[model samples]
Target: AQYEDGKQYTTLEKPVAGAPQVLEFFSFFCPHCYQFEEVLHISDNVKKKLPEGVKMTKYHVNFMGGDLGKDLTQAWAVAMALGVEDKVTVPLFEGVQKTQTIRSASDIRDVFINAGIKGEEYDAAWNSFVVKSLVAQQEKAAADVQLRGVPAMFVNGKYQLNPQGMDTSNMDVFVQQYADTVKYLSEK
Candidate 1:
């Protein structure tokens, strides 16, 4: 919905949490998503601008289909499970989009291994039921939403932020505008 402040965001029928939780559905293979990740993690100022109490996360989408996509999805789930998304997210994206090195499960493991995840610890998390469960949940969520695009945002589980309607000249602008929009909506 278009708010009075000129930020256009969609509200979901069901909420994800009692408080605002922002989620971005993206795929490492997607160029725009790679860019979004850069803006989200590289810029300390932009990352700091996110309002406290507002939870933010990235949900890897297998929108591309087939094994490569699925493998990357699993890779993201494993990284998140191992609590190394901050360290692995961009590398995963770069490995595929930039270096063309990350493609299979083993490649995904190397990302974490190089990131300091002990081999044994990595194996435990990678093969654990928890990772599978998390992947299942993310898959169901993507399917349920019938998600068709990348770098999309969900707020409070109810609102979908659409910056295209606003003057989002670039991805950076969109993120900052989104941060402001979420901050405004979160006040409620």
Candidate 2:
């Protein structure tokens, strides 16, 4: 459906419909997501090195301390709905991770514009039918799941249970394990 009425905002046309849909719920300020991105660009480069047709959709979770966390998460959803996911996810994550501060939505928006998207379109997308709904859905998801933190990844709409339950220190392996699990599932 659309967004939860009077809620934050979202961009999901529909929940990760079926296979090859990998959802990663994360926060920009989260140290773990930053580490994951670093590993994502490392020698093996798992994320950018994803196999064909395997879409790794990163969802920014807004369960942190400040309001910017929520706003920026919603803004990212706007970029996704506006057809600017690549632009928003890559460079903006790099910049925000470099500073760990999503100070304002405009700052995040500018990152998208710099990545080749127009500012007007970015703003318009913020209030678009689906983006607005996505933000609201995010807020609702927190209540529904009682989420503990950010940078959580879900493969096929379910948690990829960590065999060792490692933290950020070893999340690289955790991510890779989950990736392997998804690939195995895909092959099955």
Candidate 3:
């Protein structure tokens, strides 16, 4: 019931400094990423199964949506800085992909507003040095990985999960096995 490199994942050139980490590269504009978080709820399922201290970081990629891509990345970074990713991620996804309501930075800001985050609080995080630094780091990481797609996941910063390698005959089985693969890699 264990997964292996090349089948379930592929090893990175060098291990990312942080082991025991799950780094996810996704874009709000990506339908697959939407399905991953909304329909499949892969993130919730995987987080529930990861070991203690295994940090899960979601990196919003800036490769999609042209100028809006960078804006969304900034929005995501602000949400992370404010510790409101859980509150903002789904709504942002829904706004961009489901309802087609999100079109600019201002529209994106309203998603946070609707999440009960005060406008001033969001602005503070949005314009702060810390969030700006994180945004730069996220952009660098995405480019360094030469990311070609969304919903890409890595464990221990070295093992990139391979969706094509998993059994996808049943939705429930697929999610369980996906979580198992993440668990196996995290503990390895």
What is the TM-score of each predicted model, taking all chains together? Answer: 0.82, 0.67, 0.93
Mind giving the per-residue lDDT tens digits that candidate 2 earns over 3-92?
121221222333444423555567777776666566543213445445678776556677774788877778877866776765566666
TM-score of 1: 0.82
Residue ranges of candidate 1 with Cα displaced over 4 Å: 1-7, 13-20, 39-47, 170-172
lDDT of each: 0.72, 0.59, 0.86
RMSD of 3: 1.7
Ranking by TM-score: 3, 1, 2
Best candidate (score: TM-score)? 3
All candidates in order of lDDT, best leading: 3, 1, 2
lDDT string for model 3 (2-55, tens) is 566688889988766643388888999998899888988898899999998887
Q: How large an RMSD does model 1 have?
A: 3.1
Candidate 3 clashing pairs, residues 3+ apart or interchain: none
Evaluate residue 48 in candidate 3 and report its C-alpha lDDT on the 0 to 100 scale: 94
Which pairs of residues clash in candidate 2, taking residues 3 or more apart in a chain or in different chains?
8-135, 8-136, 9-132, 9-134, 9-135, 9-136, 10-133, 10-134, 10-135, 26-151
